[PDB]
Structure 1
């Protein structure tokens, strides 16, 4: 039960003798609740959220209209939530970047793992000896040549092969927070945070339990 917002770089607040403050600026721009359901045709609690400056002018159509269900300003892609006993379409339909969730506690984040595109053994593991120079036979990077001889085998499904890469979830978990400036939308963490300015992140309280 919380909001999502574009990462957008990261910096620190190099304390005099510290720099402990190593957060990552995560402009937490409020959401737009009003959208949710219960047991009358749907799942559980839930809560839609949308925040960004989508050109309401031209780009997305049906969604803008889909947003007319007593909402305000259609942003980018909408995400959901769950229980927490929040407000609803009965008072406003406009969350904020702060409430009762507390403070100073740790807040996990889930950027979008980049993706170095296709990657290999050496790549998706960082482990596989050999040389290069007097080699030129098994020139290091090879899978390193994996499998059997004459064996049932099945190449053993799931064995770490090359594989590719690309935008993927992540979830860091933990990560305390050094600051926050509501309205101004300026949440800070402590390094980490997946993605690279081109993400979204969910920034949930802390499913530590």
Structure 2
């Protein structure tokens, strides 16, 4: 079904009674409020537009204010959408809590990967570095051949921007749900740095 939007607080460890440590990624899923419900008559598809967090009134523009005022909800730090599973129904202003993940048992987290900037072929594509000696001349960490005896095919593994892109990790175990604190503990590491936004949805693989 639909998911929820949160923030990456950081990672810690959870101790069990049997003597096991579970690497968890803490996620602060505050009350997500709906700002727009889309249908097939006006939009062509069924979905909801939600927001979370808060924002400066002196920095929220009037176009955005009118979008929040129409739904009777406070402005947030962004807007995200989720598709409905042909049986779900929501209403504008409805605030969704982390309790939605109380019986899912698994979720697929999505976030913006960290930014490595301009990367090489050894780091980006795990290319094999050439010989550091034995005669190598200025060709220690270079790609080498990029074709044949007259064009470089499309998709050729080269250097370029690495990171700062949308990444999704699948089939993560939900270890704990604390609605009183608006938290969510998922076993394993998720994408992005501390303070980044995370989209949490139930695992679709099942």
TM-score tier, shorter chain, comes to 0.7 to 0.9
| CA distance in 2: counterparts of 1:69 and 1:41, whole angstroms | 23
Report 1:29-178 matches (<5 A).
Answer: 29-39=29-39, 42-44=42-44, 46-84=46-84, 93-99=93-99, 102-103=102-103, 105-149=105-149, 153-178=150-175
User: Is the contact made by 2:112 and 2:165 (CA closer than 8 Å) also made in structure 1?
Assistant: yes
1:8 deviates by 2.7
Task: Spell out, residue by residue over 1:149-171, the C-alpha distance to the aligned partner (whole angstroms, 9 max, x if none).
Answer: 3xxx3211111111212421111
| CA distance in 1: counterparts of 2:127 and 2:84, whole angstroms | 44
User: Is the contact made by 1:3 and 1:97 (CA closer than 8 Å) also made in structure 2?
Assistant: no
| CA distance in 1: counterparts of 2:144 and 2:14, whole angstroms | 44
- Structure-2 change in CA distance of 1:144 and 1:91 (3 Å): closer
Task: Spell out, residue by residue over 1:89-136, the C-alpha distance to the aligned partner (whole angstroms, 9 max, x if none).
Answer: 986623222355552611110111112111122121112231224445
After superposing the two structures, state which structure 1 stretch, 70-79 or 81-90, moved more.
81-90
User: Is the contact made by 1:107 and 1:174 (CA closer than 8 Å) also made in structure 2?
Assistant: yes
| CA distance in 2: counterparts of 1:43 and 1:141, whole angstroms | 51
User: Is the contact made by 1:113 and 1:195 (CA closer than 8 Å) also made in structure 2?
Assistant: yes
- Structure-2 change in CA distance of 1:141 and 1:78 (3 Å): same
- Output the aligned Cα RMSD: 3.4
- Structure-2 change in CA distance of 1:48 and 1:24 (3 Å): farther
| CA distance in 2: counterparts of 1:22 and 1:113, whole angstroms | 22
After superposing the two structures, state which structure 1 stretch, 172-181 or 92-101, moved more.
92-101
After superposing the two structures, state which structure 1 stretch, 85-94 or 126-135, moved more.
85-94
Secondary structure of the residue aligned to 1:25 is: strand
1:38 deviates by 4.4
After superposing the two structures, state which structure 1 stretch, 124-133 or 47-56, moved more.
47-56
Aligned length: 206
- Structure-2 change in CA distance of 1:16 and 1:43 (3 Å): same
| CA distance in 2: counterparts of 1:75 and 1:97, whole angstroms | 17
- Structure-2 change in CA distance of 1:196 and 1:64 (3 Å): same
**Unmatched tracts of structure 1, length 5 or more:** none
- Structure-2 change in CA distance of 1:205 and 1:114 (3 Å): same
